[PDB]
């Protein structure tokens, strides 16, 4: 397939969507709800790019790159001004309820939400009202729960239920009061519940064993082991 991103021609796979095709080419599009192992559901509305009907088109429309296929002869723009403003607006809406928690959060320096906040160029807050609060649950000795940091990207429920076939983690409530977790306090019953600490782009589900003796990612000595 042939796509044109910002006037540059690329050869992609027509069976992929535009987000995974453009991320495979090294282009940077912010995203939250899409995962390579989970698929595209179009929740966070963050991966917006401007699609044009043909080469001689100037108007276009904002579409989700994760929901739009990477078909042949597809003209899109990532660095368009309207798309950039919309992505910064999505980060701004996610920043309205987010707690002032980065120093005391175990995802600091390892946070996908921090990365996409910086990448969108959003560093000014014109929101002056209150932020919603949630009480935490006890998820057992491995996963620490902090629901204030959630951005409702639905990755945890999608992985835990649709991928890992777990039953004890879900989504409750409606509007901006959506809550993610167990119906009551107790240990997460899945054998693959620890992948939530990397599935969650925020610091909601965190490693409690690492949180006991915590240090940031830049302070680690890593090795490739088995």
């Amino acid at each position: 397939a042939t796509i044109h991103v910002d006037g540059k021609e690329y050869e992609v796979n027509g069976a992929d969507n535009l987000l995974e095709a453009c991320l495979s080419l090294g282009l940077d599009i912010p995203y939250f709800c899409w995962h390579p192992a989970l698929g595209s559901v179009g929740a966070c509305r963050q991966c917006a790019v401007k699609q044009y009907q043909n080469a001689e088109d100037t108007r276009g429309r904002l579409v989700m790159s994760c929901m739009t296929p990477a078909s042949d002869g597809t003209f899109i723009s990532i660095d368009d001004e309207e798309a950039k403003q919309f992505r910064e607006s999505v980060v701004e809406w996610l920043m309205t309820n987010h707690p002032h928690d980065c120093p005391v959060c175990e995802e600091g320096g390892n946070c996908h939400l921090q990365d996409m906040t910086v990448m969108t160029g959003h560093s000014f807050r014109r929101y002056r009202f209150t932020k919603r609060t949630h009480r935490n649950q006890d998820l057992g000795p491995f996963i620490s729960h902090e629901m204030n940091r959630c951005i409702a990207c639905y990755r945890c429920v999608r992985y835990y239920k649709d991928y890992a076939d777990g039953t004890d983690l879900g989504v409750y409530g409606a509007h901006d009061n959506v809550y993610f977790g167990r119906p009551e306090d107790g240990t997460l019953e899945s054998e693959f519940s620890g992948n939530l600490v990397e599935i969650c782009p925020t610091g909601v589900f965190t490693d409690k064993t690492h949180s006991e003796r915590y240090n940031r990612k830049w302070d680690m000595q890593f090795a490739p082991s088995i």
Binding site: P103, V104, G108, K131, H134, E146, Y214
Partner: protein
């Protein structure tokens, strides 16, 4: 709150700390040590503190006989008052619950609404 921003913002790398936690959930440094034989007194650590805990004070008289005694620990750094910033409290800003401050008690924070609430 042992957030390790000052240690990584240091261009010399003369700040070492480890995060401990109280039973009520408050982060603090288990130890905090600064190699003052290495420190260039540039103030990037004070610039990087989001709680204004680390502070460079107007005092220069710091000569030492042995270089081992130029490694100041937490018992030699922690003072009895707020220093140059007399009112800032990070935990009032934060949404994490600690002792004496529950959910919704932070500034610009609403009270937590349960999903089981009868209101639409």
């Amino acid at each position: 709150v042992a957030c390790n921003l000052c240690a990584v913002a240091c261009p010399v790398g003369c700040i070492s700390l480890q995060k401990a936690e109280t039973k009520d959930g408050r982060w603090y440094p288990e130890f905090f040590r600064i190699n003052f034989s290495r420190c260039i007194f540039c103030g990037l650590c004070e610039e990087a503190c989001p709680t204004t805990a680390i502070q460079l004070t107007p005092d220069f008289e710091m000569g030492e006989y042995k270089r081992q005694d130029l490694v100041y620990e937490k018992e030699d750094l922690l003072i009895s008052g707020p220093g140059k910033y007399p009112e800032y409290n990070f935990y009032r800003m934060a949404g994490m619950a600690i002792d004496g401050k529950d959910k919704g008690e932070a500034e610009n924070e609403a009270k937590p609404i349960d999903v089981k609430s009868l209101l639409p």
